Amino acid sequence: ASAPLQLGNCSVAGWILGNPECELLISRESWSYIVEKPNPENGTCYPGHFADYEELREQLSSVSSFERFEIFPKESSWPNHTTTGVSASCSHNGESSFYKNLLWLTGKNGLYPNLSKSYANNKEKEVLVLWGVHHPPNIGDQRALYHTENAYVSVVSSHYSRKFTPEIAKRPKVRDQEGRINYYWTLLEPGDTIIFEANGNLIAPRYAFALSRG
Amino acid sequence: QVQLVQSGAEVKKPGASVKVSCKASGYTFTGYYMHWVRQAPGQGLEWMGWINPNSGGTNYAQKFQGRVTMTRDTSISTAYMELSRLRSDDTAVYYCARDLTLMYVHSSGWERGVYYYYGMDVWGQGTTVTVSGASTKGPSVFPLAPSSKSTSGGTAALGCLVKDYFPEPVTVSWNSGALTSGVHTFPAVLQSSGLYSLSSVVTVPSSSLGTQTYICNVNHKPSNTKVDKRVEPKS
Amino acid sequence: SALTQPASVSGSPGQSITISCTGNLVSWYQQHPGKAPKLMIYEGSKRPSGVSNRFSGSKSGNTASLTISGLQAEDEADYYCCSYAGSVVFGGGTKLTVLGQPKGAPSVTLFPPSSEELQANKATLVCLISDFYPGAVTVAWKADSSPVKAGVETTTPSKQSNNKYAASSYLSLTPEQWKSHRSYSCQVTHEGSTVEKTVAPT
Ligand SMILES: *[C@@H]1O[C@H](CO)[C@@H](O[C@@H]2O[C@H](CO)[C@@H](O[C@@H]3O[C@H](CO)[C@@H](O)[C@H](O)[C@@H]3O)[C@H](O)[C@H]2NC(C)=O)[C@H](O)[C@H]1NC(C)=O
Ligand SMILES: *[C@@H]1O[C@H](CO)[C@@H](O[C@@H]2O[C@H](CO)[C@@H](O)[C@H](O)[C@H]2NC(C)=O)[C@H](O)[C@H]1NC(C)=O
Ligand SMILES: *[C@@H]1O[C@H](CO)[C@@H](O[C@@H]2O[C@H](CO)[C@@H](O)[C@H](O)[C@H]2NC(C)=O)[C@H](O)[C@H]1NC(C)=O
Numbered sequence: 035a036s037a038p039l040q041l042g043n044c045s046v047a048g049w050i051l052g053n054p055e056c057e058l059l060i061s062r063e064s065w066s067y068i069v070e071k072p073n074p075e076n077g078t079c080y081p082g083h084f085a086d087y088e089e090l091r092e093q094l095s096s097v098s099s100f101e102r103f104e105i106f107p108k109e110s111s112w113p114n115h116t117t118t119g120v121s122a123s124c125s126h127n128g129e130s131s132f133y134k135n136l137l138w139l140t141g142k143n144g145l146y147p148n149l150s151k152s153y154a155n156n157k158e159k160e161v162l163v164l165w166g167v168h169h170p171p172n173i174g175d176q177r178a179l180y181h182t183e184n185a186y187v188s189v190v191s192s193h194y195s196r197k198f199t200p201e202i203a204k205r206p207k208v209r210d211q212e213g214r215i216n217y218y219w220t221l222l223e224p225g226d227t228i229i230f231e232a233n234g235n236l237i238a239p240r241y242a243f244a245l246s247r248g
Numbered sequence: 249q250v251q252l253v254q255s256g257a258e259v260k261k262p263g264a265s266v267k268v269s270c271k272a273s274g275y276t277f278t279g280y281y282m283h284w285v286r287q288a289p290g291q292g293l294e295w296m297g298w299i300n301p302n303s304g305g306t307n308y309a310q311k312f313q314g315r316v317t318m319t320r321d322t323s324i325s326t327a328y329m330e331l332s333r334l335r336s337d338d339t340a341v342y343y344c345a346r347d348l349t350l351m352y353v354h355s356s357g358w359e360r361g362v363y364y365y366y367g368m369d370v371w372g373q374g375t376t377v378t379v380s381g382a383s384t385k386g387p388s389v390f391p392l393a394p395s396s397k398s399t400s401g402g403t404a405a406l407g408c409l410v411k412d413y414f415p416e417p418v419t420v421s422w423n424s425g426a427l428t429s430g431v432h433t434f435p436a437v438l439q440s441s442g443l444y445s446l447s448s449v450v451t452v453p454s455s456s457l458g459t460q461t462y463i464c465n466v467n468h469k470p471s472n473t474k475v476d477k478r479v480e481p482k483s
Numbered sequence: 484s485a486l487t488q489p490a491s492v493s494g495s496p497g498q499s500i501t502i503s504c505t506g507n508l509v510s511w512y513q514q515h516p517g518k519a520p521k522l523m524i525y526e527g528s529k530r531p532s533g534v535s536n537r538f539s540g541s542k543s544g545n546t547a548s549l550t551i552s553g554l555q556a557e558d559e560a561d562y563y564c565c566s567y568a569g570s571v572v573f574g575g576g577t578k579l580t581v582l583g584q585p586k587g588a589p590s591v592t593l594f595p596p597s598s599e600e601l602q603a604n605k606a607t608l609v610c611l612i613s614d615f616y617p618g619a620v621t622v623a624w625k626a627d628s629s630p631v632k633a634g635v636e637t638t639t640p641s642k643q644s645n646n647k648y649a650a651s652s653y654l655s656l657t658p659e660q661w662k663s664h665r666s667y668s669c670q671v672t673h674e675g676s677t678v679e680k681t682v683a684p685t
Binding site: 285290293294295307310327345348362364365366367368369373388389392395398404406411434435436437439440446447449450482 | 508526533559567572573593597598600637651677
């Protein structure tokens, strides 16, 4: 008794990151395959590269169990950072907004203290975790948002490891943005742990997805 | 070096309007709210309102709503405050002051998304705006007689009241310069009418009240008024 | 919606003072005469970068406090608390004096209207206040037992060559009100004690 997941005008990226124009009426839990247009209107509303994208669509294509849960709760994970960041490029009903499943972390009280956040998969299912790395268009923006010019983002899981050094770059304007957010994801097998360490530039997970590929 | 540089001193007539400018340097102008605060002579600070330079939204104080207009020109990093229907008690120093909270980083498409007032951390140097409808007018001069309630330990205070002149200054001498000890000429007061008054008081030996003449010589050069006022004990 | 500060406080160098603000996101500003205000404390107790840790903030009940330890003469200034409830509200301000002289009481001379003025059909009373320190004073005018608010003009204290302070206050009256009362009084409060002078149509 399994129907396809209909994404409407949205891409998998827009749907899985929580593009504010991509909330379905009935949030579905299992599905046979994903239906999406050749050029969906609404995907990465803040421009940037979605890494290993077709692979994620393959892996999300058949799903028997799907549960959203707040991996790093907004009102308790980040006491010393500003979490409320929105963007005009991710607007909804004419108001600036942001991906529902991510949080733009920025400085607080003139400081961006080094962060370190761990999550251990006790869901007894695979857990899909998504995050982003911000590349500002100039160094003034880098300092204003993150108070460092030597930023690092490191993500380590037992089956994925990567240290990002986001550098400044003035790219062509896309949805009014010259900077970029690059999007990444990893599937956490049960019992595995993921660690985020950063001193800036991290678009942090807020919601993750426990899932069974049945 | 974050800096707010305001426009120069202004002199206006009652019923006029004044527009003060505040130019930001050393930070991105659209990143922070801009407040306006004024302070009348000898008075406290009073908030006038804020503008959000990114959007142009404003929030005005109750005291000034209906009368104050705040605008900005982002291309020149400049905030403006226009205050119309001026009265003399709008004479004050006017300050622009940056809100301390980073609210926008427009070249990155970042917005804080929520506003709360935590304080003002960078201030302009202030702009003096003087409001006056008074015309040049010479002083009336009245003697301030020494009484027995103005005598002390062999000394008595007597003086001259210099009333209702504009503009400043007046000069007061006693006995054409021949009397300078014990002279205390107090700073003038600005009346609600826009005219000034001051007082000059000299302390003299009580023993000379019946022998020595005391005359204050008042000059108010903008009106070319010259008064010589003899001050005697009250008979 | 308003915050109440003490009008004045004074301390010797090296001491600590506390200024209160009765009404915890209060901010505090220091203003030297003729210069722009400066943010000393925000969010109750945080200091902006580069502000001395001799300045600290604290709360208790419905009272926020600014404490200055190790007072130096450069700390002499006006201090304003500030709060917000959809509108930014400043306290009335506290003049803080760092004592460099003994506290001196004001000399007050009160003059009645002259003969000349009254026959020009006007009347002014002149209260002259000199040589007080610290330079904070309050003036009250009584028309024959009872307060009088209309017709008062008072200057802000001004610093003399003495490096003490002087001020003057004028009360305008009609000749009829002047002679219709037993007496008029100038009442000068300085550091909680009062000097009162009194003149009569005599
Ligand atoms: C969700 O998808 C809709 C549909 O595409 C997006 O709205 C559309 O946004 C495009 C920009 O990618 C607009 O096109 C441009 O508009 C400007 C005017 O600002 C015009 O001058 C350009 O020539 C260009 O065509 C388009 O007008 C707009 N369409 C509608 C119907 O609103 C929307 O931005 C997406 N939202 C998110 C959060 O992804
Ligand atoms: C989903 O996509 C359709 C396009 O297939 C959007 O319909 C377009 O809407 C714009 C704006 O009114 C029109 O200019 C086009 O002519 C429409 N095209 C068609 C084929 O109807 C539709 O708005 C999108 N839905 C949402 C919610 O954005
Ligand atoms: C948020 O910031 C506070 C203050 O900087 C951190 O608390 C400090 O932790 C260190 C090390 O454990 C202590 O030595 C300090 O005394 C603490 N300060 C205070 C005021 O308690 C706190 O750990 C930070 N929280 C997170 C999640 O990083």
